[PDB]
Write a protein that binds this DNA or RNA. Sequence first.
RNA 1: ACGGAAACGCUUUCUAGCUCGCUAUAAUUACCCA
RNA 2: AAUGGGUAAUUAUAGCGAGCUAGAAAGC
Lengths: 345, 121, 121, 251, 217
Amino acid sequence: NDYRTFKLSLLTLAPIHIGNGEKYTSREFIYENKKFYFPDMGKFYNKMVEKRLAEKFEAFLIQTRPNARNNRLISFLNDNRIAERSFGGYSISETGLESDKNPNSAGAINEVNKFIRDAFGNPYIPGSSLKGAIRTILMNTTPKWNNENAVNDFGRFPKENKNLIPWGPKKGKEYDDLFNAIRVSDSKPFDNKSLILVQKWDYSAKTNKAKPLPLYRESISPLTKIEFEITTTTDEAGRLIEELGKRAQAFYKDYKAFFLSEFPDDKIQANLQYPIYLGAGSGAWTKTLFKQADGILQRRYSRMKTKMVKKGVLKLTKAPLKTSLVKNHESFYEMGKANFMIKEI
Amino acid sequence: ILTDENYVDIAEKAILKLERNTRNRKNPDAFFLTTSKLRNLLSLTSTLFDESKVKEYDALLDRIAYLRVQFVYQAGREIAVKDLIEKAQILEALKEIKDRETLQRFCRYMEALVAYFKFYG
Amino acid sequence: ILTDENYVDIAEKAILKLERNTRNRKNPDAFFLTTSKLRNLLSLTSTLFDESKVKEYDALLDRIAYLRVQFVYQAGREIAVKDLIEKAQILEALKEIKDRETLQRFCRYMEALVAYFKFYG
Amino acid sequence: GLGIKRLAVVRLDVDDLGAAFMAGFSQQGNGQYSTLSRSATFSRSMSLFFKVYINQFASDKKLSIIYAGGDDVFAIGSWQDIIAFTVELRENFIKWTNGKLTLSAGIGLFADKTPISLMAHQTGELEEAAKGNEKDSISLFSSDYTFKFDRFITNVYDDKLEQIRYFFNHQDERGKNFIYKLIELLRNHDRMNMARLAYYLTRLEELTRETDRDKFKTFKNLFYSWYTNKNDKDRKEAELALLLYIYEIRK
Amino acid sequence: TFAKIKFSAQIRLETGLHIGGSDAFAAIGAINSPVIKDPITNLPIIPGSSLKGKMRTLLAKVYNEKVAEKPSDDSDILSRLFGNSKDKRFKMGRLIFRDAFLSNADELDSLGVRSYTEVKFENTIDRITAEANPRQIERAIRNSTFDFELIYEITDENENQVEEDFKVIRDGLKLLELDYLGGSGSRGYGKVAFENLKATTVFGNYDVKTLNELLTA
RNA sequence: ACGGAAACGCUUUCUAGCUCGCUAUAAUUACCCA
RNA sequence: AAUGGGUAAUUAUAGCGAGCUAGAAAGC
């Protein structure tokens, strides 16, 4: 049998958020215990119309109100005593380090991007996430695929060639399709209460400051293990998954000297296993070709939100401590630095 | 109100009717509305548009009743979406949800709004 | 405009009039518009054209304006499809849908468009 | 086993042998050649062709000349030999009669063991429909296949049928389904079917293998020539050429 | 004689399968790649055609001694199971692969599932300039079951080849859990199991008890 | 005391056989606005 | 200097669009 399986297991050193697009907006959650609550807002509104105060709910949602402790629907659910908490939904715990210098604001957060959940309500990590993470590593750590992933003289710094890797039918040849031999399966649905909603924390270059951002994506609680089935059937992609144990550390080493140097290593994590970068907020250099997008990636941002000079601003988070994996105080983690080990089974 | 033959044109002559950036005169007559602030409008509707086909409308009416408050809320957060919902009468169309076919018709009307906004600028 | 006999030549020199790969002469006289930016449009007209022979005209008139939604939308994404609907008078011929017969005739015109688009390279 | 179990029946007719006999040579001259000796010699020449020489043109070919002579030939037989016998009969009749007195044959296909006065009637119907076409015509397998003989043997049976045969002999992807769809696109043929055929040939153009690919490219270039030829003189010809090829390769 | 036996299996999904849906009148910011669907109830079902075409290549990776280059060139251990288009006595294929229907609608309403599909955002991150290109490819939910029927023939032309092709068929049943039933493949989308095998002769006189040894073992 | 009386263009035949809606694709990027 | 707030972008891209076999036979 020429199907050479593997098994990738992924410890979570960092907050790890992935996917699902949709979110719970500013006036769309409940913080009355130390647990955040997200019910079904349609179910909540349809049960609240039996309380008949829903017209005030029309004025509550457009209410531009300072001192935002009364903005985030706890005031709607304590000022008018609707505190049933029977709305269909899922509760999660709080971070604790969620807001900086905001006493009694453990609930005045605004936007929580959802983690990816299936129809059961139990969150998992899909194999498309790990395969997109794998493709940047296996693209940067092979020198034949790093030369002409560029303009193609088609537009204004448009896109990749997408032709350095064999792709498609290719009518007249054999079956090439190299990345089809890396069948990154989806993870098993783990526990619901491993989510923390970490804040994005920008650490500026040429400005020793830790200016945070008002977007608290639901990430994964640290130090949790994840299963991944990965099978191989072609020998070249099989050798690529065999050489992952060199290519991961090689990409992280050449990415450290390209990006992570000049920045202080107190907030930067330690590896302790095979390091990798997963999705949603780890910087574009972990999602692209780092020695190919020097002036090409940052050329698009000519807006109100331009990347400082050349290269992205360092992104950190804030999440509590177990075991350390932080290597400093005030709990600045790294938002996507995961660990893996691999073994053919 | 909108029916099967007019709802594109309802979203046609409304889009030429909205105001634009009279000031900020670099590439002028650009929309105060931005594309993300209209995808935040459509992404509420487009999930119910496909939930309507599997389920039934009498097992669905609660989410459109809350979607009323969602269009109010997104209107309550900007000077353009407060303008959009009445210069293109989305809040008028939201009162008539009478069956699942009219619900899907309203969702296609929202899609027509997004399409005709993407057609200009 | 589109009648019963004149539409094939219309689609012919609406494929000819479209501008091609002038810069970067690597197999030149090739369309900037991609064939998958035409087949994703004609997969609407085909699911009209073969479900028109089963049904009335006045049962189909929900999807008929949705054609005018999607043609406006896919014209708004790439500049090539906006160029296409400027050369090929698609949105001006979607007003000319009054019955089953002219709808099937317009779908034959769309098939002539894709046929002559595949014909030239 | 290639060929269809048919039997074709040709009924020729010399086009106005009454007018070629009564007036005939009197068109030429001032009545200098309006004599009796020339008419007797001409009718003895028609007797010597249609009453002796048909046993020379039918010699190797497998058929039965049931009736011949005067201005009629009713010859039953097998359809390849019947078509080749009509080909050789007119292509040596216009050598015999200098191209004057074009003959108007009508050839119908008939299945095995179908009666003959049922068959002679249809052959005569195709014969008179070929008669009224112009001065002369062949009528092949039905009155809508009505060509001049000068268009039939040169274009179909010399040019088109050999290109069609050689194109399908020296390849083995495009079998009979492609020929059937080409016949149907040749037969329906509104304005939109030219677009459908321009899609069909181009979609098959990049589907053939790279070795024998430019054979298909020059054949679709040579096929879209006569299909969109805007004349309808080069279209029913090609449909009949494909029908003759299909009947020649019937399993 | 002439008998006809039935192979019933339950395709239990793990991270289920997107088999490209029908309607092109899709969306703007919703599903733009649906799953195939039983149009009276809009249930995602598994058609037998994807099963036959998956098992064709999955068993041609094993039982072909010759390279294929085409169909109608299989090694005649498959060409009596999946049929040839060219071989004179093997135009038929004696295997009927009925379309698997989603069965456990009752237990999956006890599980808190809104509707029996999902919308899985699966964008294309541009490898330079980092821009996104989203797709919403719809799949069946993670733990649905499907009634994979199957029907096999027995004539007066199958003396011992009834049991010759069973370990060829069971090779397909335990290599379908090596591959992905159609979909995108390399993003999961096909890992399945085949629960509750109950093989019996729905027509004709053939034994069921000595038949029941090699199926599940 | 009608070239007329009597006369089913009729009997048999699966639009069938073969065919994965497939191939590539981290819902992500950027840092802010009064 | 605090606090109030998310803002802008892409919404599927590139293809394949049907391929061969049979194209009426056998009797009345």
